[PDB]
Design a binder for this molecule. Structure first.
Ligand SMILES: Nc1nc2c(ncn2[C@@H]2O[C@@H]3COP(=O)(O)O[C@H]4[C@@H](O)[C@H](n5cnc6c(N)ncnc65)O[C@@H]4COP(=O)(O)O[C@H]3[C@H]2O)c(=O)[nH]1
Ligand SMILES: Nc1nc2c(ncn2[C@@H]2O[C@@H]3COP(=O)(O)O[C@H]4[C@@H](O)[C@H](n5cnc6c(N)ncnc65)O[C@@H]4COP(=O)(O)O[C@H]3[C@H]2O)c(=O)[nH]1
Ligand SMILES: Nc1nc2c(ncn2[C@@H]2O[C@@H]3COP(=O)(O)O[C@H]4[C@@H](O)[C@H](n5cnc6c(N)ncnc65)O[C@@H]4COP(=O)(O)O[C@H]3[C@H]2O)c(=O)[nH]1
Ligand SMILES: Nc1nc2c(ncn2[C@@H]2O[C@@H]3COP(=O)(O)O[C@H]4[C@@H](O)[C@H](n5cnc6c(N)ncnc65)O[C@@H]4COP(=O)(O)O[C@H]3[C@H]2O)c(=O)[nH]1
Lengths: 95, 93, 93, 94
């Protein structure tokens, strides 16, 4: 995973940024189609959390925005898992 | 109550999750076409499943609940895979 | 109700435009102690569902729960507008 | 890819009818040790994504991973077909 300063969703969300730096072990991005980017985030147990993005106009495709949008959805689902285990409370106390 | 749902009678896995790990499963008809199932665990964490019939004139309360519960248990299995408790269910068949 | 009541509509002119012109009805239901369901209806009665779930049940707020569920409901609705091509009509106006 | 290779199409007349009449292309990418991604495109190049993640990575199987991901992708496509009313045309042919 690269530095959190690269992703606009991490700069505007304290919660997502904290989850990204502390609880994300690896983060991979793949362009699977002309319009869609897939982001897979893993925790320390290598559990995979998936997020996707799909640009409406394929001629406006941009790797950075696609990765940032896919990562943002991936962290939305990760926060659901952190709420299930209760470890979300640990993240909230550390902001 | 598990006997009343066809998705549980046909799935040993979802029936085992329902009988042992589901605290409550409530159902609400939220619109002419859609039913919402709210599955909660013993820690009161809520898992939401929905269903929507294509033709509104075909709406059946029982089918809507069974479909939304099956979708809700699909999502709950994801949470069980995250915590590792899914292999406890797969251990007990 | 009127679009100005929702914060996500005041902060997003795309979602406000879709809500004002392409949404027939937007109803909300509290389905559980923590979750709120929003059912968005287009002029052909097709149903788009969005949900929200507050982490701390003692922090439940009706307005925030409705606003969050509506915003996610409009995210899914935009996908349907991109499928039919009506998203291009919204982006022009 | 021919529809006979997918178990989800051999078990669902609805999904197999959608795959052959309304699906232009469906590609598969293994994006991680556990997850497979399927990208279904219609004849207007609109993309519908479906994913599958095996619980035990040692049991990863390419066939099951693709079949599960395609079955998930087609479930989402049916929602788009219900929105445009095009699902009624599929029901005419099954
Ligand atoms: N399943 C599916 N959904 C689609 C498709 N085309 C558009 N959508 C949906 O419409 C929303 C708005 O599209 P937009 O292109 O006008 O704005 C896009 C676009 O402005 C930007 N974006 C995302 N990926 C991008 C990318 N790869 N390049 C440039 N911009 C991108 O993020 C915004 C929202 O991404 P999104 O994936 O969450 O939502 C899409 C997406 O959910 C599609 O072909 N298939
Ligand atoms: N977001 C959204 N999705 C819709 C809508 N209308 C249909 N869909 C989707 O089409 C799929 C197939 O609908 P079907 O009516 O032809 O078969 C339905 C229907 O035969 C049955 N079913 C579900 N709820 C029912 C109900 N309340 N009454 C009777 N039958 C019901 O389960 C099947 C699959 O439900 P589903 O929610 O998983 O998938 C829907 C659903 O995802 C809709 O208005 N909004
Ligand atoms: N399936 C499920 N997901 C949950 C549950 N509890 C939390 N989540 C997830 O974590 C987020 C809650 O964190 P937060 O409560 O601190 O911020 C919440 C909360 O600050 C606010 N919010 C939403 N509904 C609210 C409500 N009814 N009352 C007060 N605040 C609310 O919106 C934010 C994001 O809601 P969300 O639905 O998108 O994401 C949930 C949700 O995806 C849960 O019990 N079940
Ligand atoms: N977001 C996320 N979800 C996960 C992860 N690991 C498991 N899950 C979920 O648990 C469900 C049941 O896993 P299973 O491995 O015991 O059965 C799997 C498995 O028996 C089979 N399957 C799917 N992909 C496979 C594959 N690539 N190889 C072998 N079997 C596969 O399909 C079943 C259901 O797939 P699924 O993706 O819809 O649901 C998963 C999945 O939603 C994970 O790491 N991340």
């Amino acid at each position: 995973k690269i530095n959190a300063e690269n992703f606009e969703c991490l700069r505007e969300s304290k919660l997502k940024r904290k989850v990204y730096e502390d609880l994300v072990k690896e983060a991979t991005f793949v362009r699977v189609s002309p319009k869609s980017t897939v982001c897979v985030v893993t925790d320390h147990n290598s559990f995979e959390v998936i997020g996707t993005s799909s640009v409406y106009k394929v001629e406006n495709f941009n790797d950075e925005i696609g990765r940032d949008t896919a990562l943002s959805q991936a962290l939305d689902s990760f926060i659901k898992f952190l709420a299930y285990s209760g470890e979300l409370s640990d993240v909230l106390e550390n902001i």
